[PDB]
Design a protein around this ligand. Sequence first.
Ligand SMILES: *[C@@H]1O[C@H](CO)[C@@H](O[C@@H]2O[C@H](CO)[C@@H](O)[C@H](O)[C@H]2NC(C)=O)[C@H](O)[C@H]1NC(C)=O
Ligand SMILES: *[C@@H]1O[C@H](CO)[C@@H](O)[C@H](O)[C@H]1NC(C)=O
Lengths: 50, 49
Amino acid sequence: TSNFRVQPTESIVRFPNITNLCPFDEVFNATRFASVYAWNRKRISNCVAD
Amino acid sequence: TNFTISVTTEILPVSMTKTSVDCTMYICGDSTECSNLLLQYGSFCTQLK
Ligand SMILES: *[C@@H]1O[C@H](CO)[C@@H](O[C@@H]2O[C@H](CO)[C@@H](O)[C@H](O)[C@H]2NC(C)=O)[C@H](O)[C@H]1NC(C)=O
Ligand SMILES: *[C@@H]1O[C@H](CO)[C@@H](O)[C@H](O)[C@H]1NC(C)=O
């Protein structure tokens, strides 16, 4: 008729403890932006994003 | 004039392992959206079981 499974009891989260505050303001709060004919790319990695 | 007795094999299958599936768990583990979708469909896989 039915199925029997055990529901979870609590919740656990685990993130890496690296904290470097990814430079979103460097690409957002910048004075000059490149044109559409020649677009620039910046790689963001190994930090924490908000 | 002379007779001999010989034996031969003959193999016939009988049955396989009986298998039963479940509608809810095979679709997803513990998501209630699967249950809501299968209820608003109606009955599609109960006859399969
Ligand atoms: C019928 O055939 C069997 C075997 O197919 C014969 O038995 C063999 O006979 C010979 C000579 O008599 C022996 O050397 C063998 O050892 C026997 N084999 C056995 C016992 O497995 C039997 O003799 C035949 N009978 C007739 C009337 O021809
Ligand atoms: C953005 O850049 C300007 C100019 O460098 C600076 O004055 C400002 O504090 C920065 N941040 C914000 C949130 O405007």
